Amino acid sequence: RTLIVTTILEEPYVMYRKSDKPLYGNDRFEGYCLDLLKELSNILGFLYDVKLVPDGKYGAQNDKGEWNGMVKELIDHRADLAVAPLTITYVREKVIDFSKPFMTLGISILYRKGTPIDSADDLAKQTKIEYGAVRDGSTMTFFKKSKISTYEKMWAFMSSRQQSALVKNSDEGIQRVLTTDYALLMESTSIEYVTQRNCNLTQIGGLIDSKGYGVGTPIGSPYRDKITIAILQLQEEGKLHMMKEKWWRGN
Amino acid sequence: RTLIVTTILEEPYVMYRKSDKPLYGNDRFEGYCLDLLKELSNILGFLYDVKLVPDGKYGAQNDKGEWNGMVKELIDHRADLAVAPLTITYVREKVIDFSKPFMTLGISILYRKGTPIDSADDLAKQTKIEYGAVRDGSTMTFFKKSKISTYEKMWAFMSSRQQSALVKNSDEGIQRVLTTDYALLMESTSIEYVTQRNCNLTQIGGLIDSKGYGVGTPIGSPYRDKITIAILQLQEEGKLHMMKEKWWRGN
Numbered sequence A, B: 001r002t003l004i005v006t007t008i009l010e011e012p013y014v015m016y017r018k019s020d021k022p023l024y025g026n027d028r029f030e031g032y033c034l035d036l037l038k039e040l041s042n043i044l045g046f047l048y049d050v051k052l053v054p055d056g057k058y059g060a061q062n063d064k065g066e067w068n069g070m071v072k073e074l075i076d077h078r079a080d081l082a083v084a085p086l087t088i089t090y091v092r093e094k095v096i097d098f099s100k101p102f103m104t105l106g107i108s109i110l111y112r113k114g115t116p117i118d119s120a121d122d123l124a125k126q127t128k129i130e131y132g133a134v135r136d137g138s139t140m141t142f143f144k145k146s147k148i149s150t151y152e153k154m155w156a157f158m159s160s161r162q163q164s165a166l167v168k169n170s171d172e173g174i175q176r177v178l179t180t181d182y183a184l185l186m187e188s189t190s191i192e193y194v195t196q197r198n199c200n201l202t203q204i205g206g207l208i209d210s211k212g213y214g215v216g217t218p219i220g221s222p223y224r225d226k227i228t229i230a231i232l233q234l235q236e237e238g239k240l241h242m243m244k245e246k247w248w249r250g251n
C-alpha cells in the first residue's frame, strides 16, 4: 500500500523546488515536511505519494458538520496521512487521529531590537507602541476568546483600534513592524523564521499559548502510533533539531 | 472501576498538604498533577485512588528488560494511570502508552541578571564563566549523547571539569549559581519555578531540546485517547495555563 499523503504549500514546510530539472512526483517538492516524511518513510518502511490538498485549506468545519481541507481528505479516506504544519486540536480529534507532535509552538511577540520591552505585560499597559495580529487568524482568535485579564486588555486595544492594529496577513504585519512603531503577535515558529532573516527584528518574551503540529490520520489508522514512535526517535536522536536548523537558519 | 493512579512526590507537581486536618486518601495531596487529575476526573467521569509509587522511581530499564518505578506499575497492571512529570520517550512507548503532552519543556540555562550572556553559544566559546549540569541526570546525558558541535564542545568542558562543573543535585546547582560565577543547565520548567522565587536569577536563551510530559497508561488502555482529548480541552480553554500559574508564580 503506497500511502497518499495530503499536504499544503507553506514556507518552509512544503514548497516547489526551484528547478526546471525533470522532477516528478514527490521530487517536485522540498521543505521541512518533505524531509520529515522521508525520515518517517525510512523508519516505518512505506512508499508514499504526496498530493497537495485540492482546496488549499488546512481543515475547518461548517454548521452542518461538513469539513474541508486536509482534514476532509482524511475523513473521506482520500489520504492516509496529513503531513503539514497542522495543529492538533480538540475539534479535529473528534474526526481524525494525530501522532504526538513533531513541533511545539506558541503565540509570541515580534518587535525591534534595543527597546526596554520584554513581555506582553509591557505592551498591555501602554498605548504609544501599537500592537496587533493578523485579522481572523488563530492568534487574533486566541485573544478574542481569552479570559486572562492581561490578554483581555490586549484584545480590547486590538479590537478598538481594529482598522490599524489588525493586519491583513503576516507579510503586511512584518512590514508594519519594520516601518512603524508596531509589535506583531504571531506564532513562535514564524518569529524564529523571520528573525533569522531580519537582523533588526527580535522575539519579545516567551510563549503566550501552546500547541503542537502532528501527523493527521483517519480515526483508527494503524500508522498513527508508529509515526509517534518515529517522531520520538527523531526527536531524541537530534534529527528534528537538524531538520528545523536546515530550513530555519538565515544568512 | 475506581482507577489507581501512580504518581511520585515532586514539587510543585505532587506534595503532601501542609495540614494536620483529617485528610484522607486523595485529599492528603496537592500540586499541579493533583489539580490536573481532578480536571481529568471531571471531564472523563472517573473515580480514582492516588498511590505513591512504592520504590519512588520514575521508571527505567535494566539489562534483563526489567522495569521499575511508575512504568513498572503500569506494566504490571497495578496502576491504571501515571500522572506525574513523566517524560514521553521512545523506550517507554515500547512498553506503555502515553496521552499527548500536558506540558512541553526543554533544557535551558539558569544564570544571573545583567550580563551580556544571551545563549549557549555565548557560554561554549569561553571558560571564565563555568557551566554544567546535575551529575547523571537527563540534562547531562543529553550533552553526553549530542552530536551537535556546540553541545559537544559544551560537554567537553563539563566532562574535563568533572569535579566542579557537574553538581550533585538541582538544589546544589542553584546555590552554585547564587554564590559562584556559574550557569546551570536545567529543564525550562525548573528554571521558571526558580526564577519566580529568585529575583536575582534569570533564564538565558531558549530551549536546547524538547520533550513532553504525558499521562502514562498500560498498552491498549481505553483511557489514553480520552485523556488526550481532555488535555486538549484544558489547553485550549486556558486551564493548563491557569494551573501552571497557580503553582509556578512566586511572591
Ligand SMILES: N[C@@H](Cn1cc(Br)c(=O)n(Cc2ccsc2C(=O)O)c1=O)C(=O)O
Residues within 6 Å of the ligand: A010, A058, A059, A085, A086, A087, A088, A133, A134, A136, A137, A138, A139, A140, A170, A185, A186, A187, A190
Ligand atoms: N496550523 C494551522 C494553520 N497555520 C499554519 C501556519 Br505555518 C501558521 O503560521 N498559522 C498561523 C497563522 C496563519 C495566518 S494568521 C496566523 C496567526 O498565527 O495569527 C496557521 O494558522 C492549522 O492547523 O489550521
Ligand SMILES: N[C@@H](Cn1cc(Br)c(=O)n(Cc2ccsc2C(=O)O)c1=O)C(=O)O
Residues within 6 Å of the ligand: B010, B058, B059, B085, B086, B087, B088, B133, B134, B136, B137, B138, B139, B140, B170, B185, B186, B187, B190
Ligand atoms: N521527567 C523525568 C524525571 N524528571 C522529573 C523532573 Br520534575 C525533573 O525536573 N527532571 C530533571 C532532572 C532531575 C534530576 S537532574 C535533572 C536534569 O534536568 O538534569 C527529571 O528528570 C522522567 O520522566 O524520568
Ligand SMILES: [Cl-]
Residues within 6 Å of the ligand: A098, A099, A100, A228, B098, B099, B100, B228
Ligand atoms: Cl497519541
